């Protein structure tokens, strides 16, 4: 194991889609749940896989405050997404913050969070660590329009077979 | 040696985003910084890397639970300092 600078050290963000996981908004939701008592946690990584399905979620409670947490300034959308699913609407009251049922992170622009922030395009995935020098990085690393889909959620009791955001309905 | 009759949770294909140009005012903007890079599953590297990513998320969550930083954790120096301390 050879390390020369800190620049040789790469944190790659891999997606759940690339590991044969169904990332429709109805199948992704059920991997997410709210809870109280655990705080957000963020981490930086250096590059990321171009994801297939990303999410831009803006669901609010019948009061009006947005369920998810207002992102810090350094939170930007996922750079390379092929499809973005705008989930938007009105959902019954729910306390706490939405985390992952798998232990995976919500990948942002070079930031991985344990919770999703309102107004920001994220993908689901994980972080790997690999160490490589320039001679080998030159051979291991060889040197876009998004499709927007729109969904809404309806306020009321969720069914037992449903994501945290409830049943989602695609619209125009 | 490696055959897709073996892998079942890995897509073997992987593309990633990674004169006066170094000056902030003259460099790329925040949506023009990333170059597309292609990574081949030459020695089953792509599926090892998906596997690594999937495996690291227990160490990573545990570590992020250890810490009280509520802004953004920096992992690079962490990895380095433990490299230098392992020897």
């Amino acid at each position: 194991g050879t390390l020369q600078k800190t620049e040789d050290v790469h944190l790659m963000g891999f997606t759940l889609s690339g590991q044969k996981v169904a990332d429709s908004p109805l199948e992704a939701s059920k991997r997410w749940a709210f809870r109280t008592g655990v705080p957000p946690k963020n981490v930086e990584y250096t590059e990321g896989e171009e994801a297939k399905t990303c999410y831009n979620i803006s669901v609010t409670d019948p009061s009006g405050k947005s369920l998810l947490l207002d992102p810090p300034t350094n939170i930007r959308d996922y750079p390379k997404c092929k499809t973005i699913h705008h989930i938007q609407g009105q959902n019954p009251h729910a306390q706490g913050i939405a985390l992952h049922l798998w232990g995976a992170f919500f990948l942002y622009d070079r930031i991985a969070s344990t919770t999703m922030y309102r107004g920001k395009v994220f993908t689901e995935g994980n972080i790997a660590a690999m160490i490589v020098n320039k001679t080998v990085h030159k051979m291991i690393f060889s040197r876009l329009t998004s499709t927007n889909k729109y969904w809404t959620s309806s306020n009321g009791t969720q069914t037992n077979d449903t994501g945290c955001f409830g049943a989602l309905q695609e619209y125009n | 040696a490696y055959s897709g009759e073996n892998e079942n949770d890995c897509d073997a294909e992987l593309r990633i985003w990674s004169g006066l140009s170094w000056i902030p005012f003259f460099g790329p903007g925040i949506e023009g910084l990333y170059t597309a890079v292609l990574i081949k599953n030459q020695n089953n590297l792509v599926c090892r890397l998906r596997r690594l990513a999937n495996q690291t998320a227990k160490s990573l969550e545990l570590l992020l639970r250890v810490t009280t930083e509520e802004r953004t954790f920096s992992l690079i120096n962490r990895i380095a300092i433990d490299f230098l301390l392992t020897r």
Partner: antibody
Amino acid sequence: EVQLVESGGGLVKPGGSLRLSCAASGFTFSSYTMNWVRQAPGKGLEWVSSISSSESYIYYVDSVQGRFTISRDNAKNSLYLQLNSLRAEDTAVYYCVRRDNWNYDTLDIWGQGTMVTVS
Amino acid sequence: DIVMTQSPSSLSASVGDRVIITCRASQSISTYLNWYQQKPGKAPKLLIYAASSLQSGVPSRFSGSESGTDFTLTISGLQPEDFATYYCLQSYDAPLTFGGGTKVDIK
């Protein structure tokens, strides 16, 4: 025995749709990247599309970009190619080809092919 | 798009002859080149891959070598069944591209 079988090709009027199928056998279809290559009468081979196992990398040859749509259903071990706004230059025999992602992404399993005529 | 230039477009040869077919890339594609052999009315068959490796079930008359962007197909001893149209295909980035071909006739 690993085999790919093409069907769903016929005679179509210039300016309408035609849907091709493929049905894998013998190998794990969900683990491999699938391609479509056509050969126009008396011309050479021509790669047209590829879809990756997880369906996350999708590629087309710009002659057909926006016109054709590739997809797959991994449970059915089936590969599909929807051909839209068909042209006089789209007359070609189409194969479904498996790309082996662990032997340097080589196209090794071809089908017998199906003929698509746009007259 | 990566371009592929196969040479010549046609070649005349006899049985037992040595045949040299060349293949040139616009950019550098490493060793991600394959060679095919197609007969009229038949699906193309994979002979060389990784620019030099031999596909199971292919005789050892066919052989591939790489020198930068330049690649070579080589059939040192021709059988009466080795008259067919060959192509090189780059398997590196997409769109994947095939050469023009090479028609090997009887001399």
